[PDB]
Design a protein around this ligand. Sequence first.
Ligand SMILES: Nc1nc2c(ncn2[C@@H]2O[C@H](COP(=O)(O)OP(=O)(O)O)[C@@H](O)[C@H]2O)c(=O)[nH]1
Length: 1377
Amino acid sequence: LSHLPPGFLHLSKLQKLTASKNCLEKLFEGLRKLQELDISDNKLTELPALFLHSFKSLNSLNVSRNNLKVFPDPWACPLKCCKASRNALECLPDKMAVFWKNHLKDVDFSENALKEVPLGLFQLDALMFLRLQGNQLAALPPQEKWTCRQLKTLDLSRNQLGKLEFPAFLSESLEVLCLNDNHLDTVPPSVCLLKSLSELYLGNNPGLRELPPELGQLGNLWQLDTEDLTISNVPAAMLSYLRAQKLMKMIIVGPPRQGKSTLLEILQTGRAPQVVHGEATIRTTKWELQRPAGSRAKVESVEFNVWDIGGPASMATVNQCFFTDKALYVVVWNLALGEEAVANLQFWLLNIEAKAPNAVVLVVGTHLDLIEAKFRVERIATLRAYVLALCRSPSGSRATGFPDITFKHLHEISCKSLEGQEGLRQLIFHVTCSMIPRSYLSLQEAVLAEQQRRSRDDDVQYLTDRQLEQLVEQTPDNDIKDYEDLQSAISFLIETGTLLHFPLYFLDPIWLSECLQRIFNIKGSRSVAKNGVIRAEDLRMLFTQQTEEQYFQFLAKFEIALPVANDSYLLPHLLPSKPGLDTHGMRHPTANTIQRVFKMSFVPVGFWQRFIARMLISLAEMDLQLNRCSTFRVKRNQTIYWQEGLLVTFDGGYLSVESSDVNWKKKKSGGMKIVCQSESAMAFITDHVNSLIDQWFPALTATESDGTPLMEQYVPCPVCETVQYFDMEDCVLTAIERDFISCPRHPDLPVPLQELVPELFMTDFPARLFLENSKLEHSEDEGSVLGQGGSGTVIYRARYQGQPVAVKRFHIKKMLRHLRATDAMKNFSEFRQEASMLHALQHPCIVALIGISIHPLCFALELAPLSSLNTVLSENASFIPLGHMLTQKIAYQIASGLAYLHKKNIIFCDLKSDNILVWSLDVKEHINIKLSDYGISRQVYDEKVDMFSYGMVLYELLSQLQIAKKLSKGIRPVLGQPEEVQFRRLQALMMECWDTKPEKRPLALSVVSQMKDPTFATFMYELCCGKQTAFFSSQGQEYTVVFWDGKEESRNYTVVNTEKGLMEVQRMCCPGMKVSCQLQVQRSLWTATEDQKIYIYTLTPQQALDTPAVVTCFLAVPVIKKNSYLVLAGLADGLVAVFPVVRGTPKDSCSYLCSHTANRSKFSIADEDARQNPYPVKAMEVVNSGSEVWYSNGPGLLVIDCASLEICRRLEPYMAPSMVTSVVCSSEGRGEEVVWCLDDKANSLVMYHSTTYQLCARYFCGVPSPLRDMFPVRQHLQAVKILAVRDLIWVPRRGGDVIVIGLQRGRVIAVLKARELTPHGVLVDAAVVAKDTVVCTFENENTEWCLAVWRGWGAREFDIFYQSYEELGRLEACTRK
Ligand SMILES: Nc1nc2c(ncn2[C@@H]2O[C@H](COP(=O)(O)OP(=O)(O)O)[C@@H](O)[C@H]2O)c(=O)[nH]1
């Protein structure tokens, strides 16, 4: 097309017009409602102003890719976006801020030919985006006259700028700055202010040679463009040097004997030692070290926070806590104690590496003066070789899990003779090599002053996070703004020896170490009532001041003051010695008796104390209940224990963890004696925690350098006992694929693995499940894989006697056999843990197990045939893709599953729509979706973390670093207004659970209990239509369409449609005096004012016909005669008039019927009767398929027929002087019209059979609690007006609630009260707008009408909704199995 036809101009109702990809040389050769229009990629050369001025309500403009020369002047319109890129426009108007200042958002003008821009162009406060690429802008307007505070992306690439200042309020708004292909040579200082800027582009600038250091003050910047840049300050992650625009922690350790303190003053000063150290758990000074001879390329002065964690053979396994990364560990050992000192030193070397990796470690030999000089050179060479033999493998490589120690790492001190003192000083300085601070050093004096202030007063010398950040901020020159900088401020402060993180912060270890010493010295006491239990109030006098909440918190992290029930505390260091009571006597019935033995190489001193105490607290947790451990739920009895081993009797099962000598090929060392016989659940909590205590206390997994991982697990052969020990390294590996093994001494007799190691087969579980491989068929292909869950846990598609299931097999295929041995062991250690927690779940909406297999090791879950929730929502992604009814069912099932597992002390993690499995989308069926729990917790996961993700998973239901980072501070995603979603009540849960306040969010049972109220899903939204006069509706689909307001020329009608919730007409002028009644059918409107006249419109009255009185209501009836919808209606005087309905008729034949005259003669009712008072006629109805009609007459109900047009019956269901309000005919169940009626003052209700004309029932509507009440059938409580919703019958009240009742016995089934609407006013008029929705108008004292809309649920919807709620509750509570 070369031009748009002129006829499009006259289309004033047109809104969208697309004419792109054409040859429109001229746009033309009214339209005030146009919103979207594109004329881009055309041959347009100039835009006439007359054509564009007609768009008074335009929203989008597109004149890009055109040959335009002069831009048209702006006009009055709420334009939102304009595009004029790739044009030849050499000028722009300077009036866009007159009308588009608060409306225009997006401006595209790239690839244009402006040498300058107007100043007013930057005055748009509502600007969203701006592009100016490929422009000749050699100058810019001044920054002080710019008000564009909402701009987010600024584009200035391919410009002549700089051949330059911008305002600072774009710092928190702008994110992308484009300055590529420019002639800029120096960076203006204003660039260093944009905090929220994310991407920087300043490439293709030959004039760039240096970058100001202040550019690094922006933390959101991540992208730096250095392409085609002749930069110099950039070294050959780029913000590291821009962002940053001597103190080391050294630890000396060793055996409790030897000096370990004489080395200090030998390094501190010269000469022989002259100070007696005595005994001290720790001492700390800031030792100085200068440059020795030969030093080069190093700092002149380096300050060491010297440090000696010594102990009197005690304080082991706790002094390890004083180990930090990036430290200089130097162990001190005696050269005169022979090779056995090196074997002792094995513990320290492995402990240091396993706790503080990537930290340099040195070895030094003191007290060597006893070594004679004749063989001295030979002696260290032999002694150093063994020390190197530990760190270096026999092949020459570094031993696994050992510090990096080379040949040039061993030296000598000779404290008394002073020889070699200078040797250490040069190397310690030398080894320091091969390794923001201005503010971090500024924090140093604060914490050191914090140490000094608490030193005089002996205050508790530990700083919690609350007292830290205030201390950080209060310091002078406090520039700590970045959150990661504050964390790095503490992280760096650990390595200067001033703070200890303890993953609560501890500053001075001297107070910390001494405080633990006093607790370690309670052996001399009142015998603590034996068996190591101390009362809480009995420990107060044993440095503390009312800080027991936190002072006794880190004592639990030290495994020394674990809490116990009945308000008691335990001390591992003071366990009972050996209460015998004939232990191991007749504790061996030899019935499914399993025994397991460990080696652990060398037994430490802090092992038994930290182990037995750890057993008791975990053991006492199981019976107190009446991924974390979820096994061994058996009963606890007599709980006898001592300093080494315990003995607990569960189900008559002697679980003994006693300790005794163990004899492998090396017939030495101590080990475990784990036995667990019962009748046959074989559960090992001992092995699980014992394999976990090594994480808190490493250095027991000693590889011994030369391929000897002497952390061994052994079991005795029951046949051989009738002793050889069966290794774990081959037992478990033979337990992963086969059931029978070959005993070395009994090759022909295969011992059953179910007896030699029952736990690895988890015979604990009941025999019911026991999935077999014979019947099941499955495949290992990728096509059957349903994803992964981390650490193996592969899923496949399997058939279980014909029922498809999703097996979860643990496929993990990562000396090397020990590596596989510990890899296979952790699988069963976690396979049982997840199986125990899943098998315990029997909730209907939780995926339950169907079986467990060992050969192959796997177990099958329940597979949803209809994929995941994310998958099904993909194709359907208007609003509410799942469905109005399906949404509530699904939103309750998730809550129900959340309610059960939160009750079961199980906490989800990453509640994602992918994790949701959907079974059936059918509404009639009961259960649709179910969960799959990942992980538990003990009574980032913080219980209510799922509720924060509950909104996110349900956010997409209504519809990764920087991908999900705004949730930290709290930013709500894009959600529509409640007025259009039509499901407002649940959108309260979107405002809910979406705030940083965790305790504000409700509990899972509270959300489930909220599903009980049927108001939750029936409610659509709340709408306000301003100040109106009366509520009117109309028949059909058009909904309520009038909402009159005003008087005479101010008489206006506000059209409010319910389906969308918008106002297509808002107070449009229309002549006419005050109106009382209206009706709309087909295309005919019958609007009647209170001037006793009727006006009609073909939607300025078409014609006017007078009436004897003021009419009250209209209702057309289907007489099925000449397709006439006879519009007979009653007036205030009580008479009724019948009018023709064809527009091609005069419409003047009133044919009025005298209601009083008919009653006088036909029914012999005297004028003196109260029923003869001229009551206004309230409402009609249609009955007998329109063949007969009733209408209101005070207390009676006169009946009128379409055939004879005469009253045939007189019926009185009320007593004088009552007036009836409204009357409705449903006839939905089966024939048998069930017409109803109400009252103005008696608030009653009637039950009438049309054929019988009998008062079947009289239900009273005045009951304040109509929740599931009943009635027999043959100020805020008054009923307002009746209306039929499909089959059910609603009785809205003046209090705002609607009383829906069911049809024989009549039962009221719900009370859809809306307690969130009381302030909005009082309900006056309510009516049905469509067969699926009902509206009610809340009118307040201020004459303002508020629209409340409820879903039109019939008998079917409520019955299936009510049964769905109760059945799932039945399906869980009634399941006692
Ligand atoms: N004669 C001599 N004694 C030494 C040497 N090195 C250490 N010592 C002794 O070690 C003792 C100090 O040990 P101590 O500090 O109590 O050990 P710690 O508790 O582990 O720190 C001093 O009494 C010294 O006599 C040495 O080279 N020569």
